Design a protein around this ligand. Structure first.
Ligand SMILES: Cc1ccc(C(=O)Nc2ccc3nc(CN4CCCCC4)[nH]c3c2)cc1I
Length: 142
Protein backbone atom coordinates (compact mmCIF):
# COMPACT_ATOMS: atom_id res chain seq x y z
CA UNK A 1 0.00 0.00 0.00
CA UNK A 2 2.90 2.36 -0.90
CA UNK A 3 2.85 4.89 -3.67
CA UNK A 4 5.47 7.44 -4.59
CA UNK A 5 4.59 10.39 -6.89
CA UNK A 6 7.43 12.44 -8.55
CA UNK A 7 6.75 16.04 -9.87
CA UNK A 8 9.30 18.45 -11.41
CA UNK A 9 9.71 22.13 -10.63
CA UNK A 10 11.85 24.53 -12.69
CA UNK A 11 13.29 27.53 -10.79
CA UNK A 12 15.12 30.04 -12.95
CA UNK A 13 16.12 33.64 -13.47
CA UNK A 14 17.04 36.05 -16.19
CA UNK A 15 19.27 39.11 -15.64
CA UNK A 16 20.60 41.86 -17.96
CA UNK A 17 21.95 45.48 -17.84
CA UNK A 18 19.11 48.07 -17.32
CA UNK A 19 18.72 51.14 -19.65
CA UNK A 20 17.61 54.30 -17.65
CA UNK A 21 19.40 57.55 -16.56
CA UNK A 22 23.01 57.56 -15.17
CA UNK A 23 21.17 58.94 -11.98
CA UNK A 24 18.70 55.97 -11.47
CA UNK A 25 20.99 53.53 -9.53
CA UNK A 26 19.70 50.05 -10.62
CA UNK A 27 22.27 48.51 -13.04
CA UNK A 28 20.16 45.43 -13.87
CA UNK A 29 16.76 44.07 -14.64
CA UNK A 30 16.06 40.58 -13.43
CA UNK A 31 13.25 38.07 -13.35
CA UNK A 32 12.99 34.96 -11.11
CA UNK A 33 10.37 32.20 -11.55
CA UNK A 34 9.01 28.81 -10.56
CA UNK A 35 7.20 26.83 -13.29
CA UNK A 36 6.42 23.26 -14.39
CA UNK A 37 8.01 21.59 -17.44
CA UNK A 38 6.09 21.86 -20.82
CA UNK A 39 2.49 20.49 -20.66
CA UNK A 40 2.51 20.22 -16.81
CA UNK A 41 0.26 22.44 -14.67
CA UNK A 42 1.94 22.89 -11.24
CA UNK A 43 -1.05 25.09 -10.09
CA UNK A 44 -2.85 21.75 -9.41
CA UNK A 45 -0.52 21.10 -6.38
CA UNK A 46 1.05 24.57 -5.68
CA UNK A 47 -0.98 26.86 -3.35
CA UNK A 48 1.47 29.81 -3.68
CA UNK A 49 5.13 30.67 -4.22
CA UNK A 50 6.77 33.17 -1.83
CA UNK A 51 9.92 34.92 -3.07
CA UNK A 52 12.01 36.42 -0.20
CA UNK A 53 13.94 39.35 -1.77
CA UNK A 54 16.96 41.12 -0.22
CA UNK A 55 15.82 43.17 2.89
CA UNK A 56 16.77 46.33 0.88
CA UNK A 57 13.74 45.77 -1.45
CA UNK A 58 10.35 47.30 -0.62
CA UNK A 59 7.86 44.51 0.41
CA UNK A 60 10.68 41.93 0.12
CA UNK A 61 8.10 39.10 0.73
CA UNK A 62 6.61 38.68 -2.78
CA UNK A 63 3.64 36.28 -3.07
CA UNK A 64 2.28 34.62 -6.28
CA UNK A 65 -0.97 32.76 -5.48
CA UNK A 66 -1.30 31.69 -9.18
CA UNK A 67 0.78 31.42 -12.38
CA UNK A 68 2.93 32.99 -13.39
CA UNK A 69 5.04 32.44 -10.25
CA UNK A 70 7.63 35.17 -10.86
CA UNK A 71 9.09 38.47 -9.66
CA UNK A 72 10.27 41.10 -12.14
CA UNK A 73 12.64 43.66 -10.56
CA UNK A 74 15.44 46.14 -11.06
CA UNK A 75 18.53 45.97 -8.79
CA UNK A 76 22.22 46.65 -8.25
CA UNK A 77 23.51 43.27 -6.84
CA UNK A 78 22.86 39.51 -6.76
CA UNK A 79 21.76 37.79 -3.53
CA UNK A 80 20.56 34.48 -2.14
CA UNK A 81 16.78 34.36 -2.41
CA UNK A 82 14.77 31.92 -0.30
CA UNK A 83 11.85 30.62 -2.44
CA UNK A 84 8.99 28.78 -0.66
CA UNK A 85 6.68 26.58 -2.79
CA UNK A 86 3.55 25.94 -0.66
CA UNK A 87 1.50 22.79 -1.47
CA UNK A 88 -2.28 22.15 -1.64
CA UNK A 89 -1.50 19.34 0.91
CA UNK A 90 -3.31 18.83 4.28
CA UNK A 91 -0.34 16.84 5.78
CA UNK A 92 3.50 17.06 5.72
CA UNK A 93 5.25 18.29 3.81
CA UNK A 94 3.16 21.54 3.45
CA UNK A 95 5.95 23.39 1.59
CA UNK A 96 9.53 23.17 0.29
CA UNK A 97 12.12 26.02 0.58
CA UNK A 98 14.88 26.47 -2.02
CA UNK A 99 17.86 28.80 -1.61
CA UNK A 100 18.12 30.42 -5.05
CA UNK A 101 21.39 32.06 -6.28
CA UNK A 102 20.04 35.25 -7.92
CA UNK A 103 23.34 36.33 -9.58
CA UNK A 104 23.67 39.17 -12.14
CA UNK A 105 25.88 39.46 -15.30
CA UNK A 106 28.90 41.70 -14.47
CA UNK A 107 31.56 43.49 -16.60
CA UNK A 108 29.89 43.27 -20.06
CA UNK A 109 29.11 39.48 -19.92
CA UNK A 110 25.98 38.38 -21.88
CA UNK A 111 22.57 38.25 -20.16
CA UNK A 112 21.99 35.45 -17.56
CA UNK A 113 19.34 32.83 -18.42
CA UNK A 114 19.56 30.01 -15.80
CA UNK A 115 17.29 27.13 -14.95
CA UNK A 116 17.37 24.83 -11.93
CA UNK A 117 15.36 21.55 -12.24
CA UNK A 118 14.07 20.17 -8.84
CA UNK A 119 12.50 16.65 -8.65
CA UNK A 120 10.08 16.40 -5.67
CA UNK A 121 9.31 12.84 -4.39
CA UNK A 122 6.03 12.59 -2.41
CA UNK A 123 5.96 9.30 -0.43
CA UNK A 124 2.46 8.04 0.43
CA UNK A 125 0.51 11.24 -0.44
CA UNK A 126 -3.13 11.35 0.83
CA UNK A 127 -5.58 10.24 -1.91
CA UNK A 128 -6.61 13.87 -2.70
CA UNK A 129 -3.03 15.25 -2.82
CA UNK A 130 -1.91 12.25 -4.95
CA UNK A 131 -4.66 13.23 -7.44
CA UNK A 132 -3.44 16.92 -7.50
CA UNK A 133 0.18 15.79 -8.15
CA UNK A 134 -1.01 13.51 -11.02
CA UNK A 135 -3.36 16.25 -12.51
CA UNK A 136 -0.21 18.50 -12.52
CA UNK A 137 1.61 15.87 -14.69
CA UNK A 138 3.17 13.94 -11.74
CA UNK A 139 4.19 10.27 -12.26
CA UNK A 140 3.62 7.18 -10.04
CA UNK A 141 6.98 5.37 -9.39
CA UNK A 142 5.52 2.96 -6.68
C1 LIG B 1 23.26 42.54 -1.55
C2 LIG B 1 22.21 43.36 -2.24
C3 LIG B 1 21.51 42.83 -3.33
C4 LIG B 1 20.50 43.53 -3.97
C5 LIG B 1 20.15 44.80 -3.54
C6 LIG B 1 19.13 45.57 -4.33
O1 LIG B 1 19.09 45.50 -5.55
N1 LIG B 1 18.29 46.32 -3.61
C7 LIG B 1 17.21 47.09 -4.08
C8 LIG B 1 16.59 47.96 -3.18
C9 LIG B 1 15.44 48.65 -3.55
C10 LIG B 1 14.95 48.46 -4.83
N2 LIG B 1 13.86 48.98 -5.49
C11 LIG B 1 13.85 48.44 -6.73
C12 LIG B 1 12.87 48.87 -7.78
N3 LIG B 1 11.57 48.19 -7.65
C13 LIG B 1 10.71 48.51 -8.81
C14 LIG B 1 9.42 47.71 -8.80
C15 LIG B 1 8.78 47.70 -7.43
C16 LIG B 1 9.39 48.78 -6.55
C17 LIG B 1 10.90 48.59 -6.40
N4 LIG B 1 14.85 47.60 -6.93
C18 LIG B 1 15.57 47.61 -5.74
C19 LIG B 1 16.72 46.92 -5.38
C20 LIG B 1 20.82 45.35 -2.45
C21 LIG B 1 21.85 44.65 -1.84
I1 LIG B 1 23.08 45.71 -0.44
Amino acid sequence: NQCTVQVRLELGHRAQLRKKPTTEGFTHDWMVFVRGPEQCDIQHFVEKVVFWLHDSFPKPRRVCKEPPYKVEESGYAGFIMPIEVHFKNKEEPRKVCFTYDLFLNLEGNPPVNHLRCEKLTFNNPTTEFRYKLLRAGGVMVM
